[PDB]
Ligand binder design. Structure first.
Ligand code: NA
Length: 129
C-alpha cells in the first residue's frame, strides 16, 4: 500500500506514535517519506546482506527474521514480511522498540540526515488529526 501523507499521519497517531519517546508526529511522517515514500512494500538490500523492510525500512540485522541475515536477531519477534503489510501495526510496534534502544530516531540514518532539525511539522500541515 502507498499511503497518503495525512492518511499515514492518522494511522501513526492512532497507533500512538505521536510524541512517542518525545518525537512529534511530523518526525515519523518525515522518516517514512524518505525511507519508503510511504510504500508499505518498500525493500532495500544493505551491503552487509541485511534487508530493510516497510514504511520505516526496519532492518533484519536486529529487528525481524527473514531467514537470510546470518548472525542477526529478531528483537521485534516478527517475520520481516509483517513489515510489508497494508496494516502498519507491526511496523509501528517495532519502531517503538527501535526508538527506545538509546539513540532515539538517529537509528534511522535518513531521519538524521533529512528530517532532524528541519520544520517537521510541515509533514502534518493541513491533516485532520
Ligand atoms: Na534477523
Amino acid at each position: 500500500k502507498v499511503f497518503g501523507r495525512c492518511e499515514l499521519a492518522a494511522a501513526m497517531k492512532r497507533h500512538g506514535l505521536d510524541n512517542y519517546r518525545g518525537y512529534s508526529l511530523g518526525n515519523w511522517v518525515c522518516a517514512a517519506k524518505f525511507e519508503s515514500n510511504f510504500n508499505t512494500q518498500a525493500t532495500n538490500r544493505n551491503t552487509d546482506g541485511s534487508t530493510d523492510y516497510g514504511i520505516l525500512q526496519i532492518n533484519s540485522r536486529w529487528w525481524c527474521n527473514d531467514g537470510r541475515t546470518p548472525g542477526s536477531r529478531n528483537l521485534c519477534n516478527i517475520p520481516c514480511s509483517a513489515l510489508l503489510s497494508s496494516d502498519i501495526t507491526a511496523s509501528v510496534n517495532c519502531a517503538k522498540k527501535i526508538v527506545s534502544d538509546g539513540n532515539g530516531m538517529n537509528a534511522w540514518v535518513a531521519w538524521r540526515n533529512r528530517c532532524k532539525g528541519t520544520d517537521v511539522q510541515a509533514w502534518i500541515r493541513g491533516c485532520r488529526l
